[PDB]
Design a protein around this ligand. Structure first.
Ligand SMILES: CCc1ccc(C(=O)COc2ccc(C[C@@H]3SC(=O)NC3=O)cc2)nc1
Ligand SMILES: CCCCCCCCC(=O)O
Length: 257
């Protein structure tokens, strides 16, 4: 029944709004001058970077990098709260639950990162600030190319014009992979994902009826996520070797194995 699929979609959207304080709908209202929300202080160089705490509640590159790192640990926390709400996920073997998160968590971070980006920069501090792509790329090596592959993806991805009710099901599909390395019981995972994929497919054609093959173009985007993740991992191993004094969160170290 299509009707059970819509109920699942409604359930996941509601759980996505409850788990993530900054939705794409809010992010786009901030980014584009809407009166439902307020304007971000823009950071484009070092003076505005230090002017930035005068509005938004060590060297500059390592400080920015370690805040982006604190934020990621926070998103991991929000993603795990979302994941538990995906029907059947808490019912799986605990070891497989850990494996799905470990491998799914960064692909979801960069999907939702895209909600907070345009070609020019990225919202920070829950929408209160905006950090210019040009500033980030001007950071000293090896940090200037830290964010550029996320912007390249985001610009391509934001072109699909997905909204939060689409994204809620898509990030569920990402978690419930079943081709993840080290999974004990693949088949229960594949059964949950086949359901999510049916819910996503219906959602896309009801919400985007004039968008030809949007289901397939979005599933292809999963290729770009995998490559962002693997590049970021390699870049981190270079930062850790040249910056032996920069501390990495154990939660992120446990995932990066
Ligand atoms: C590289 C892409 C990116 C993503 C998110 C952020 C953020 O920074 C947004 O969320 C925030 C904002 C501000 C801080 C302050 C940090 S935190 C600390 O430990 N000392 C500080 O100055 C922490 C987190 N930046 C960059
Ligand atoms: C985004 C510019 C403000 C820098 C520090 C913001 C507060 C730090 C935090 O929330 O962890």
């Amino acid at each position: 029944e299509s009707a059970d699929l819509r109920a699942l979609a409604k359930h996941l959207y509601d759980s996505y709004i409850k788990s993530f304080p900054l939705t794409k709908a809010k992010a786009r209202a901030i980014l584009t001058g809407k009166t439902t929300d307020k304007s971000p202080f823009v950071i484009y160089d070092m003076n505005s970077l230090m002017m930035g705490e005068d509005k938004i509640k060590k060297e500059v590159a390592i400080r920015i990098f370690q805040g982006c790192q604190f934020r990621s640990v926070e998103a991991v926390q929000e993603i795990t709260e979302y994941a538990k709400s995906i029907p059947g996920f808490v019912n799986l073997d605990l070891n497989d639950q850990v494996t799905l998160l470990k491998y799914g968590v960064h692909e979801i971070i960069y999907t939702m990162l895209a909600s907070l980006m345009n070609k020019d920069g990225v919202l920070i501090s829950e929408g209160q600030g905006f950090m210019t792509r040009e500033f980030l790329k001007s950071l000293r090596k090896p940090f200037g190319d830290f964010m550029e592959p996320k912007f390249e993806f985001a610009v391509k991805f934001n072109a699909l014009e997905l909204d939060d009710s689409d994204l809620a099901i898509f990030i569920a599909v990402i978690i419930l992979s079943g081709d993840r390395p080290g999974l004990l019981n693949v088949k229960p995972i594949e059964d949950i994902q086949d359901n999510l994929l049916q819910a996503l497919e219906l959602q896309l054609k009801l919400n985007h009826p004039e968008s030809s093959q949007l289901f397939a173009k979005l599933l292809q985007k999963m290729t770009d996520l995998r490559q962002i993740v693997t590049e970021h991992v390699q870049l981190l191993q270079v930062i850790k070797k040249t910056e032996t004094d920069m501390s990495l969160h154990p939660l992120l170290q446990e995932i990066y194995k």
